[PDB]
Structure formats: structure tokens, C-alpha cells
Short mmCIF file of C-alpha atoms in Angstrom, two decimals:
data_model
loop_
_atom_site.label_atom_id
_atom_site.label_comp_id
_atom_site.label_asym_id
_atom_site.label_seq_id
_atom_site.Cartn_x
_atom_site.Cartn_y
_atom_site.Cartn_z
CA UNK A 1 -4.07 26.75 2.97
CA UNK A 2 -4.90 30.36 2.48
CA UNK A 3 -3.58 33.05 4.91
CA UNK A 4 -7.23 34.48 6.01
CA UNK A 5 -7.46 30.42 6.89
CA UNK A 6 -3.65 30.02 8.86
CA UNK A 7 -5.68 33.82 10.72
CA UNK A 8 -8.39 31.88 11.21
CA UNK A 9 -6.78 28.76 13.12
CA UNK A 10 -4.47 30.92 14.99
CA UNK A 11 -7.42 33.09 16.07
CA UNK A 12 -9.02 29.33 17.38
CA UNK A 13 -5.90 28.28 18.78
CA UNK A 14 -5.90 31.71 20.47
CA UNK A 15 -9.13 31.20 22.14
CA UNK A 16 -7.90 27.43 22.78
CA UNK A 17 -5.05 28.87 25.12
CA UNK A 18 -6.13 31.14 28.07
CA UNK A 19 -8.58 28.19 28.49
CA UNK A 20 -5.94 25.82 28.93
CA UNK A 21 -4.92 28.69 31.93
CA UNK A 22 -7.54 27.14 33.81
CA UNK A 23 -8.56 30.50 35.11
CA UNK A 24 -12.20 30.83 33.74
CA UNK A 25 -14.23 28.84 36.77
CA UNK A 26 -12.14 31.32 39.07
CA UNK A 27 -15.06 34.22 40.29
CA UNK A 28 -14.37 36.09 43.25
CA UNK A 29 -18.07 35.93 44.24
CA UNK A 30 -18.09 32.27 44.37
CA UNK A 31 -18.88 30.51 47.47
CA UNK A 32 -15.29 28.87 47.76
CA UNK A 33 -13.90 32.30 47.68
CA UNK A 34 -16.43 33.33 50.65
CA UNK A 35 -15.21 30.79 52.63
CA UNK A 36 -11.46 31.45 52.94
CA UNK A 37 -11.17 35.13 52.00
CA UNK A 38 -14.62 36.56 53.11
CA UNK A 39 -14.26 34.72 56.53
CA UNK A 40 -11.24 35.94 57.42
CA UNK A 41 -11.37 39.84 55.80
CA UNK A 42 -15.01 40.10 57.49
CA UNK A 43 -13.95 39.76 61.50
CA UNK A 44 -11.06 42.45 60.79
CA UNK A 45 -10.32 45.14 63.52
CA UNK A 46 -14.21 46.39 63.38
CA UNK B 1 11.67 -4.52 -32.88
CA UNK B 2 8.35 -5.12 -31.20
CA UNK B 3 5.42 -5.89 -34.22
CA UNK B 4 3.57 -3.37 -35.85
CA UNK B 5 0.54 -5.39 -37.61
CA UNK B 6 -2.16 -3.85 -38.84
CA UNK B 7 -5.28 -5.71 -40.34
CA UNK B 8 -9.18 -5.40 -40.24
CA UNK B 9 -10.75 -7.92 -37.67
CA UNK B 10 -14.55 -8.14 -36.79
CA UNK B 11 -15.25 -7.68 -33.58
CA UNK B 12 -16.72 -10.85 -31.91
CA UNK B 13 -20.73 -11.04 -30.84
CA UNK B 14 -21.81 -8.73 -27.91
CA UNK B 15 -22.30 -10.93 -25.29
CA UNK B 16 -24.47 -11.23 -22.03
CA UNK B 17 -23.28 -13.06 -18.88
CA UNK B 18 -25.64 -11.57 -16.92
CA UNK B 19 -23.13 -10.33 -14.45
CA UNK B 20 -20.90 -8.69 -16.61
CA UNK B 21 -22.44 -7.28 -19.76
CA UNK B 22 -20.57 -6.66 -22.80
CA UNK B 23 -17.40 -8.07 -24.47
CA UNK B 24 -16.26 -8.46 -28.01
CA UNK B 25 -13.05 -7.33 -28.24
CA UNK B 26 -11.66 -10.04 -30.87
CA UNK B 27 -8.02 -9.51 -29.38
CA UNK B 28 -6.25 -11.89 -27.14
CA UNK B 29 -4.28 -9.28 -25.41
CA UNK B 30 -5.40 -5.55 -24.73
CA UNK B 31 -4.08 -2.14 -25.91
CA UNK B 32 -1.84 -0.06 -23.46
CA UNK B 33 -0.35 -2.77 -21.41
CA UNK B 34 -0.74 -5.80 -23.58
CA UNK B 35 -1.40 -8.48 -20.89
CA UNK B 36 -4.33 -11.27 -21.72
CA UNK B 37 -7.96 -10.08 -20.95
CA UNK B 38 -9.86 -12.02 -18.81
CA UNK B 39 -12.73 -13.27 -21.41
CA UNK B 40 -14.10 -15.25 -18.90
CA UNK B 41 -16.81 -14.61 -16.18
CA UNK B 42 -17.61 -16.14 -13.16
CA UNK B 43 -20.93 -15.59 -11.96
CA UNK B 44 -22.47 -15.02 -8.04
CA UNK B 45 -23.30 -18.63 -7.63
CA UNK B 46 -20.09 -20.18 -9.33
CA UNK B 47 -17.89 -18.35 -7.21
CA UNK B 48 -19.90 -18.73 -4.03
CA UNK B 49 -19.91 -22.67 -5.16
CA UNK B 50 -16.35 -22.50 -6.24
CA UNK B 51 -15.24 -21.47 -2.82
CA UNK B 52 -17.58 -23.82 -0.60
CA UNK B 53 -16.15 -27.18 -2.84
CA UNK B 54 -12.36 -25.84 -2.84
CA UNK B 55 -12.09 -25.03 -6.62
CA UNK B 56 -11.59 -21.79 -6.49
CA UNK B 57 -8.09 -20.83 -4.98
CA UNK B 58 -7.73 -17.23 -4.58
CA UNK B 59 -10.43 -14.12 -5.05
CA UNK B 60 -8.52 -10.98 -5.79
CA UNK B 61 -10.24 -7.65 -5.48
CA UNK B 62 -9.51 -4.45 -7.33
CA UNK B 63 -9.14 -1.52 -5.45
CA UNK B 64 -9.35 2.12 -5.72
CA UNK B 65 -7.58 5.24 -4.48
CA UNK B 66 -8.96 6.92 -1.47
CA UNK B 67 -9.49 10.65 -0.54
CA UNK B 68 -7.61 12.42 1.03
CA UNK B 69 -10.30 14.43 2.84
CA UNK B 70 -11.60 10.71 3.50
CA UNK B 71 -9.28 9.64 6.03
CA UNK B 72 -9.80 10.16 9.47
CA UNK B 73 -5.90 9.79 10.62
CA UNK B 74 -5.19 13.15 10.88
CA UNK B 75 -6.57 16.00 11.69
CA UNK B 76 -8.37 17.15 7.86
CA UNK B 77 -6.23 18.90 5.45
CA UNK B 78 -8.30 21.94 5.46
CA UNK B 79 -6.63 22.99 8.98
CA UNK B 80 -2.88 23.98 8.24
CA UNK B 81 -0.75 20.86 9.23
CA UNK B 82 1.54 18.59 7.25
CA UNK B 83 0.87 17.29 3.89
CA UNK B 84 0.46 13.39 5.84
CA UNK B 85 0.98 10.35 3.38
CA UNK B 86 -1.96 8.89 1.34
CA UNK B 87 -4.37 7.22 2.80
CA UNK B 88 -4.60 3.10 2.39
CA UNK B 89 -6.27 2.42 -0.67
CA UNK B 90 -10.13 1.69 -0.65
CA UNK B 91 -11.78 -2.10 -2.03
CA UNK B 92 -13.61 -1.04 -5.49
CA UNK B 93 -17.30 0.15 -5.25
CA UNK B 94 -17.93 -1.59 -8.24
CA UNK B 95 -17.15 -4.92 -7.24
CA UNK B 96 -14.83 -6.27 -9.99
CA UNK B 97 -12.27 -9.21 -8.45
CA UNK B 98 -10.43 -12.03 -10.00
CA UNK B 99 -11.14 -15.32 -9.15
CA UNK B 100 -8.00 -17.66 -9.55
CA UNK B 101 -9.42 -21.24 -9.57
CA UNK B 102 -7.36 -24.71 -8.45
CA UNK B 103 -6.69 -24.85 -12.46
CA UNK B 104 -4.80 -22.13 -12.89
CA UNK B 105 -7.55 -20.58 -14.79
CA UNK B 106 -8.48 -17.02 -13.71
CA UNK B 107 -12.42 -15.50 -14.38
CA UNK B 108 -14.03 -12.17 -13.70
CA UNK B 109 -16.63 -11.57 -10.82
CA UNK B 110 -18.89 -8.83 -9.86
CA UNK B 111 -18.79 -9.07 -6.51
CA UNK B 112 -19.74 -6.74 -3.61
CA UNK B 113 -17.29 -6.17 -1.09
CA UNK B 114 -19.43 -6.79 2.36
CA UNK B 115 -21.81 -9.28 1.04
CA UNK B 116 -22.93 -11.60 3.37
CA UNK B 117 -23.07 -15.43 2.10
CA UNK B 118 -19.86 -14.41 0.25
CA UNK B 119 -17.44 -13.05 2.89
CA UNK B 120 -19.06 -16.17 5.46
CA UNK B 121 -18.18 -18.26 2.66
CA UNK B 122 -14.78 -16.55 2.64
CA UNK B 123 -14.00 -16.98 6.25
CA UNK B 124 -14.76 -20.33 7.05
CA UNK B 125 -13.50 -22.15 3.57
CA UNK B 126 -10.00 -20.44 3.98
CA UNK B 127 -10.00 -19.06 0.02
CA UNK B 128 -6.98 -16.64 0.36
CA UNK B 129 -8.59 -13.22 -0.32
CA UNK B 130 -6.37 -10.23 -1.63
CA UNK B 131 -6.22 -7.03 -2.84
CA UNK B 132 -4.73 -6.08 -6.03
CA UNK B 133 -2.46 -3.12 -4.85
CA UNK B 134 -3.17 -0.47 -7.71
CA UNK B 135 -1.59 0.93 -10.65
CA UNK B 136 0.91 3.19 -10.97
CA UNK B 137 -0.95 5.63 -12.94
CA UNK B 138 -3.85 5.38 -10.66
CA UNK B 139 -1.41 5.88 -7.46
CA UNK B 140 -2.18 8.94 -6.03
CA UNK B 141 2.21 8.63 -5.11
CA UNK B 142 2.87 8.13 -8.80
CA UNK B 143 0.35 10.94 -9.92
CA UNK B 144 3.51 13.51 -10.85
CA UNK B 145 5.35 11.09 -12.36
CA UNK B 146 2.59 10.16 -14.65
CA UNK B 147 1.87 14.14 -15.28
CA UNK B 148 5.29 14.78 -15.91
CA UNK B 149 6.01 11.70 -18.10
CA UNK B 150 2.87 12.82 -20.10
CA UNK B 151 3.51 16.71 -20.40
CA UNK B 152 6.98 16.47 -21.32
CA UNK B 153 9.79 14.52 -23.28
CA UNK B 154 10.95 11.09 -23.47
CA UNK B 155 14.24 11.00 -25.31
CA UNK B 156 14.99 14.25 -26.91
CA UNK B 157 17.29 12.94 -29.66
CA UNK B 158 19.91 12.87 -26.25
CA UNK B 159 21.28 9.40 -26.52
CA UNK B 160 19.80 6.03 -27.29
CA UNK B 161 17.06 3.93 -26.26
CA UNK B 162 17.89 2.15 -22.97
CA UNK B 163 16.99 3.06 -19.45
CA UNK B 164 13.79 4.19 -17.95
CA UNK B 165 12.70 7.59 -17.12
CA UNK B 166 15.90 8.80 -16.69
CA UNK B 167 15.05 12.32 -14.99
CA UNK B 168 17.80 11.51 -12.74
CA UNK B 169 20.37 11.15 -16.01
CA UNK B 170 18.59 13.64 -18.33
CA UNK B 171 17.49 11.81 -21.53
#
């Protein structure tokens, strides 16, 4: 196989890893997150 | 030492079996290998008949090389990966079997691999089916040593005459 193709599936394998991180479904604004961090950072010292 | 005849023969009639078209050919064995050609033909119904009363024996089908890009064992050989062995060869598209018969005698067919009445016939009268493996310079394995043994020499005046392809032992 060419070298522009071995780029090519190394570029895709790439992109396959940092999926297989399993940290793309993490967003801090997600209701899980509220209900943990935002409930216990909210009462602070106020 | 083998013969080296040479005389002028008319080729026999053209004929038409329907099945299989042509045929004249007015020598018992053919060029390049020299085994006996199969003059005879069996047609759709003889076979299928054939196989249902016991007479025919065995139905051997030819078979032909498969793609590489074809097989779905391995990822396809456009992605970078290992070379993988050759796929298992394919039936032939075009049909053309042996049919060995309780005589010994042995006829040509035209005969579909997947057809119906003929593969039921197949599986319940117990006519051993086969697959003629395929030659060596149709293997897809054997296609460098056929392209090597074609672009280059034989004997080069080395020894003598008595081995075979001795690439190992040069010439």
C-alpha cells in the first residue's frame, strides 16, 4: 500500500483511539454531573 | 525419446450436442499436457437420470481461482495488513464438470453449480460430488513459479537432462 494510504489508516486509527478513552459522553453540564458536584459546591459557606 | 510425428489429418465434422457446441479435434490426446479429451457429452437430462438410477458414480466440478479482494476473511487488502493466504478456490461460473459413470466411462456436462433438481438430485441419491482442485498454472500459489519458469532458462547447457526445476540446484 502507498504511504499517503499507511497516513491515511493511521490518521483513522488515530481518531479510533481517544474514542476508545471513553471520555466523549463526559460534559460537565450534564445532569449526572449536577447531581454530585453541583449539589455539593452550591450549599458552600454562602 | 518421446515421438515427434508430423502428418496432415482432417479435422473431424463440427458437431452439436446441444449442450456443448463444438468439437473436431481429430486427436485422441490434446496438446500441452497430452492426457485423453473427453469427446463425450453428457447432457442435463442424462446426468440428472444418470444420478436418480445409480449409473453415474461421481460428478466432478471444475473450479476457478478466487479474488483476492473477494474474500471476506480478512480485513481487504487495500488497508495495510498482512499479505493473508489465497482464498479457497471458487466452483466454475461456466458450469463444466465431469461425470464419471458406474462404467468407468467419464463424459462432459454443462452444469450450473446451484441448480435446483440437480443438487436435490445430488443430495438424496448419494453421487459423490467433488471438486477438481486446480492447476498449477492456474494456482494463484504457483503463479511465480509459472512466470519464472516462462521468463527464464531451463537447462543452460549446465548439466544433463534429469531433475525438475532445479532452482534449488541451479540447472
Amino acid at each position: 500500500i502507498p504511504t499517503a494510504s499507511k497516513n491515511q489508516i493511521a490518521l483513522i486509527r488515530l481518531n479510533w483511539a481517544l474514542n476508545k478513552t471513553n471520555i466523549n459522553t463526559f460534559t460537565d453540564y450534564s445532569k449526572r454531573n449536577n447531581l454530585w458536584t453541583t449539589q455539593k459546591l452550591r450549599n458552600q459557606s454562602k | 525419446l518421446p515421438a515427434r510425428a508430423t502428418a496432415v489429418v482432417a479435422p473431424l465434422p463440427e458437431k452439436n450436442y446441444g449442450s456443448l457446441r463444438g468439437g473436431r479435434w481429430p486427436f485422441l490426446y490434446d496438446n500441452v499436457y497430452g492426457l485423453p479429451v473427453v469427446r463425450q457429452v453428457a447432457s442435463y437430462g442424462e446426468v440428472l437420470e444418470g444420478i436418480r438410477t445409480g449409473r453415474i458414480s461421481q460428478v466432478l466440478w471444475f473450479q476457478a481461482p478466487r479474488a483476492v479482494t473477494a474474500s471476506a476473511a480478512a480485513p481487504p487488502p487495500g488497508l495495510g495488513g498482512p499479505q493473508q493466504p489465497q482464498p479457497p478456490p471458487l466452483a466454475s461460473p461456466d458450469g463444466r464438470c465431469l461425470v464419471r459413470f458406474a462404467n468407468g466411462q467419464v463424459k462432459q456436462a454443462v452444469i450450473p453449480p446451484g441448480e435446483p433438481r440437480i443438487s436435490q438430485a445430488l443430495q438424496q441419491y448419494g453421487t459423490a460430488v467433488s471438486y477438481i482442485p486446480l492447476e498449477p498454472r492456474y494456482m494463484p500459489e504457483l503463479a511465480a513459479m509459472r512466470a519464472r519458469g516462462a521468463q527464464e532458462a531451463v537447462l543452460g547447457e549446465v548439466d544433463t537432462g534429469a531433475v525438475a526445476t532445479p532452482v534449488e540446484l541451479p540447472e
